[PDB]
Design a protein around this ligand. Structure first.
Ligand SMILES: Nc1ncnc2c1ncn2[C@@H]1O[C@H](COP(=O)(O)OP(=O)(O)OP(=O)(O)O)[C@@H](O)[C@H]1O
Ligand SMILES: Nc1ncnc2c1ncn2[C@@H]1O[C@H](COP(=O)(O)OP(=O)(O)OP(=O)(O)O)[C@@H](O)[C@H]1O
Ligand SMILES: [Mg+2]
Ligand SMILES: [Mg+2]
Lengths: 110, 391, 391, 105
């Protein structure tokens, strides 16, 4: 399982994960890095709308991974690096430099 | 500023007051909440007298700054408690399970009533994952079981209550904010805000001051007085005042935003919960100076039970720490005091015989015996003979 | 150290206490648990007086080290028993079936109550495959029926209980840890921990001492007496030590973390379970020099019921092994002793008559025909008359 | 582009690149050794806090250079040699030896 910090990130960066993203694109990369199952990919892969595949990808994902690695190491490869960069920035304004998360990486989207 | 409203509505948060806002409190309920972004499973106790306006200010803060929702906390869950039964502390969480649940599978909502607690609790903290930085507002806690369960649920809680004797159950650091009676200067603002005649006749001035004194900062009652001055005529406020010293809150009772027509209806509930022996202490507290700093011994005279009079003080402190029923002061000398609003309720509700009985005993103690010094002058009950003649 | 908390929360383990840790015990409840990794289906009995603090120690012993959960045992299941009905020993396991179950299929949870005890048992040991080497904490066992089923379920159990007369139910590796009354030196630490004037002045040191004696080293009622030292002034501690020798635990009752407002409310339950004839023994314990090593024969005088007498001792041993109400020693001579806390419960918990009645019987056999030797001086229980003087 | 080794280094030596460093100091030296662009230096040069200029320097950099040379050959000149020495040490405990950590603990 993840936690509040790692799940608060998937939620904060949600206005964005809706405008450009697709869970079908990540299913192959995750059945692989060992974080899914052949029913998992079935469940998220056959979904009429994308907000469905997205809400199932973010639900299923928060349970399966020991951390938020194999999803930054994916928006990179998928030419959606403007995404994996935002999330890695957010994970950094928490461990090393505390406090700075709310003024810097949280407010500019109110 | 349009995303908040989505989040406020879904967290069942009541709309904050607009025509009059308290910057000092609302601004003090927001501050303390921001300080707790790093902290987890914390209690904030917005405690006050019945009708003070605690519940109004919580929502006020929640909706004012947009930082609390979005920046500091991701979502809001605001649930009214008011639980008295023993099943109530369990029922609250069933309503807090579906709140937390998805719009999907409210259809699948099972026979939740027939479920073990150890399951409702585990079932909640099992779905609470999908809820990063969650702030739960528990408007109107009476029982400590809700405080108990909550601490077992490692929740982040704003809490509106009257009794601050249950916040202490929690064995974790707790922050408190007391909703005091509306200060004199403030009141004025409250009136002008809703609307009232401006100070014009020196007497009229003085009379308005007396009125603000009577209702010891109880916006609920203040509203009751206001709503019921429709003529908005001073000449009709002076007709209304009188009605009070002859009918208690009862006559003033009118339809208001308050769930309650009459404040006496509210305070009732504050007199039921009271320790059986503490109830009578209050019952005998009726025959007392109103809004006057008076000694413990002078009180030892009417209150039930060797140089062990201290038991009087213990009752007066406990009673004061249950919806602010009393206002004990430490210096110069240990003294308490009643408030008019707190006075018209008990007076018009308690037994007159007890009132008399009490008034008869006081004289016995007397014969035995703002800078009042009832140390050589307690013998005399003639100082408040004005109040004393009324019965 | 973040994975534990996940595992603790899901196993329904309570927040470990922080402001004061009983080192020697928590460190003795962890040790013994580590020693048991191979031996499967074992019982650990953390048994003590009521409010003696057993349950808190299990909270801490599973919350200090990172070894017990992850290294020594994979998962935790902590369930509070408190079962009295005959359906209770079955109901506990229904709550231990869903605990063990997956987050999925709590929806599918069937009509579990309507099933045979041969199915709930088989149904549990059928799903118990998933989690191996799993320990189950059974906070507050009263019925030996629990200990029975568990042994049939080959479980690994920590057990918090007051009566250590149920382990007899298990034919097995039973190991024990007794939560004693808080030692004198320790207590001090407990107080300082919670913030309190320490023993400094003479009369006050001598005044601070009296306190412990009364609580007779008891954390629960040592807490209740502090949540009622609101002023935190020694002058107010003394005001109360008094309140105690006139109101028993009743007056000191102060709402706190303990599910119980009064210790007498707790001990009740320890006096209901008691053998009908053993119950009668408790009543006479009251009339006795509280906190004194006193002979069996001197007890034979007040206790109900033969050329040879040994029935008094049998009652005193059984009674001592069931809530730790009485403390008996072997050497120099077979003697037992009551504890103040165990004494005030009765002083306010027995028929006002049966106190005085019993005193007359003791005086009768009194005439007859720390190194107390009531062998030539029993005729005069005056050494204890200091207490006997009291009605 | 770099790779996992060369990027794992910029990450491992990160507790340090925060305490003493500045991307403005390196922008001129890199617009030069041909690894930046006049929008690149604009983007990293106008940033209110330094953790911004640093996170953009380390993001932008990992894409542009064929290797991790023109950044050791800089902490040297900038009197921040205690940095370029740590990174050259790290590139060596991998360049001169075919053994590391495997999937383990
Ligand atoms: N800031 C305010 N503006 C206008 N009316 C107020 C305000 N504060 C309190 N009131 C009056 O009190 C009523 C509700 O009081 P409120 O719920 O705020 O007090 P409370 O402390 O919650 O009482 P309780 O604890 O019984 O809920 C409103 O209908 C209004 O009449
Ligand atoms: N280490 C401790 N620190 C603080 N308070 C303690 C401690 N141990 C016991 N207490 C007091 O006792 C109360 C709970 O006692 P605890 O549950 O630990 O005893 P117990 O032996 O479980 O009693 P029971 O067997 O009746 O459950 C707490 O609310 C606290 O007041
Ligand atoms: Mg309200
Ligand atoms: Mg307990």
């Amino acid at each position: 399982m993840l936690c509040e910090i790692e799940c608060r990130a998937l939620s904060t960066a949600h206005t964005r994960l809706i405008h450009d993203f697709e869970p079908r694109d990540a299913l192959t990369y995750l059945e692989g890095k060992n974080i899914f199952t052949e029913d998992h990919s079935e469940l998220i892969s056959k979904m009429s709308t994308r907000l469905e595949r997205i809400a199932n990808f973010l639900r299923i994902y928060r349970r399966q991974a020991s951390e938020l690695g194999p999803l930054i190491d994916f928006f990179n490869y998928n030419n959606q690096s403007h995404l994996a960069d935002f999330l890695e920035d957010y994970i950094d304004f928490a461990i090393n430099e505390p406090d700075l998360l709310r003024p810097v990486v949280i407010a500019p989207q109110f | 500023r349009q995303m908040l409203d989505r989040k406020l509505l879904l967290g069942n948060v009541p709309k904050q007051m607009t025509c009059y806002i308290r910057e000092y409190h609302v601004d003090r309920v927001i501050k303390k909440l921001d300080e707790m972004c790093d902290l987890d499973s914390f209690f904030l106790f917005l405690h006050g007298r019945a009708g003070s306006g605690k519940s109004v200010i919580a929502s006020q803060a929640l909706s004012k700054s947009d930082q609390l929702i979005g920046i500091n906390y991701d979502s809001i869950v605001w649930l009214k408690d008011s639980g008295t039964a023993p099943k109530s502390t369990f029922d609250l969480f069933t309503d807090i399970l579906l709140m937390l649940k998805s719009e999907d599978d409210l259809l699948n909502f099972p026979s939740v009533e027939h479920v073990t607690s150890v399951v409702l609790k585990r079932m909640i903290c099992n779905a609470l994952i999908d809820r990063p930085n969650t702030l739960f507002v528990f408007d109107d806690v009476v029982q400590e079981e809700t405080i108990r369960w909550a601490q077992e649920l490692r929740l982040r809680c704003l809490v509106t209550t009257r009794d601050v004797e249950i916040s202490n159950a929690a064995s974790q650091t707790c922050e408190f904010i007391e909703v005091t009676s509306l200060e004199i200067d403030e009141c004025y603002d409250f009136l002008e805000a809703y609307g009232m005649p401006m100070p014009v006749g020196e007497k009229e001035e003085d009379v308005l001051n007396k009125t603000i004194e009577l209702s010891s900062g109880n916006p609920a009652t203040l509203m009751m007085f206001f709503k019921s001055c429709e003529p908005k005529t001073f000449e009709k406020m002076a007709q209304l005042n009188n009605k009070l010293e002859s009918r208690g809150l009862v006559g003033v009772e009118c339809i208001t935003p308050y769930s309650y027509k009459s404040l006496a209806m509210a305070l009732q509930r504050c007199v039921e919960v009271l320790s059986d022996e503490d109830r009578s202490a209050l019952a005998f507290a009726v025959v007392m100076p109103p809004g006057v700093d008076i000694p413990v011994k002078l009180w030892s005279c009417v209150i039930p039970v060797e140089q062990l009079d201290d038991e009087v003080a213990d009752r007066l402190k406990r009673l004061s720490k249950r919806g602010a029923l009393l206002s004990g002061k430490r210096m110069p000398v240990l003294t308490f005091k009643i408030d008019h609003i707190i006075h018209m309720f008990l007076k018009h509700v308690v037994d007159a015989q007890t009132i008399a009985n009490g008034i008869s005993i006081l004289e016995q103690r007397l014969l035995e015996i703002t800078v009042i010094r009832p140390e050589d002058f307690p013998k005399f009950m003639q100082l408040h003979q004005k109040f004393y003649d009324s019965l």
